[PDB]
Amino acid sequence: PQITLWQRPLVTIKIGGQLKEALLDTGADDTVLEEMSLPGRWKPKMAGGIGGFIKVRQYDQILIEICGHKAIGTVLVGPTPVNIIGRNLLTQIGCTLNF
Amino acid sequence: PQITLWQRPLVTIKIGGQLKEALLDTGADDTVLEEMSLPGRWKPKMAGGIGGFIKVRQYDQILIEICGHKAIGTVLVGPTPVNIIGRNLLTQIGCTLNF
Ligand SMILES: Cc1cccc(C)c1OCC(=O)N[C@@H](Cc1ccccc1)[C@@H](O)C[C@H](Cc1ccccc1)NC(=O)[C@H](C(C)C)N1CCCNC1=O
Numbered sequence: 001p002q003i004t005l006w007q008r009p010l011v012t013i014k015i016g017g018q019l020k021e022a023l024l025d026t027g028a029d030d031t032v033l034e035e036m037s038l039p040g041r042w043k044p045k046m047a048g049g050i051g052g053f054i055k056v057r058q059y060d061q062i063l064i065e066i067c068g069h070k071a072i073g074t075v076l077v078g079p080t081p082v083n084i085i086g087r088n089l090l091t092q093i094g095c096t097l098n099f
Numbered sequence: 100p101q102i103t104l105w106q107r108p109l110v111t112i113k114i115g116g117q118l119k120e121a122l123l124d125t126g127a128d129d130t131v132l133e134e135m136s137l138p139g140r141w142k143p144k145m146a147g148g149i150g151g152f153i154k155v156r157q158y159d160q161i162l163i164e165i166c167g168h169k170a171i172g173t174v175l176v177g178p179t180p181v182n183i184i185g186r187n188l189l190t191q192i193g194c195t196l197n198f
Contacts, residue, residue: 003196005186009125025126026108049149087104095198097102
């Protein structure tokens with residue numbers, strides 16, 4: 001689908017058997033999800049946004065189903081205000097900017 | 100142009116007679132630019148991303164040329180680590196997401 005940007009580009013993702021709403025975010029290198037129940041081993045990391053840094057849990061090779069399309073990659077989990085889908089997953093679903 | 104997301108989507112902007120590189124950011128509501136020389140009256144305002152909030156100077160109706168396309172709108176200037184073009188300008192150059 002083509003998405004215009006008059007609204008926040010919020011899509012429906014399915015991750016860890018759960019349904020969530022996330023923002024397709026071209027300005028993000030990585031995917032960062034709010035505190036949620038995820039299975040597996042992890043490694044502690046920091047993510048540097050606009051106001052500073054947040055301590056997140058890094059999970060590798062996690063499956064997300066973004067708006068009907070499937071991707072497998074790195075997901076960070078931490079105290080972020082919005083669920084962010086970054087470029088590490090957006091490339092896998094073939095997402096492009098167009099103007 | 101079509102822009103894929105394997106790299107940061109950086110475009111050349113021209114603002115206030117000057118050339119800068121800015122990130123095309125679907126995950127940003129507003130346009131925020133690194134400390135730079137702009138003419139005009141401003142209003143103090145507060146942008147909050149991941150990790151907290153930054154104090155910015157708000158200018159209304161700044162002309163920006165993004166990758167050859169002209170746009171006029173609100174530009175925030177503050178201690179952002181990256182120049183960010185947000186949806187308030189992205190909508191004006193007919194920028195869409197596609198997958
Ligand atoms: C939401 C908003 C409203 C008004 C104005 C602005 C600029 C707004 O956006 C601010 C903002 O931080 N938006 C983020 C997503 C957002 C929306 C709403 C709330 C919080 C965040 C994201 O798109 C841009 C921002 C850019 C950046 C900052 C520092 C270093 C490098 C890049 N990118 C990042 O933080 C990403 C994260 C998300 C994985 N990131 C951080 C690790 C290094 N690389 C990287 O890519």
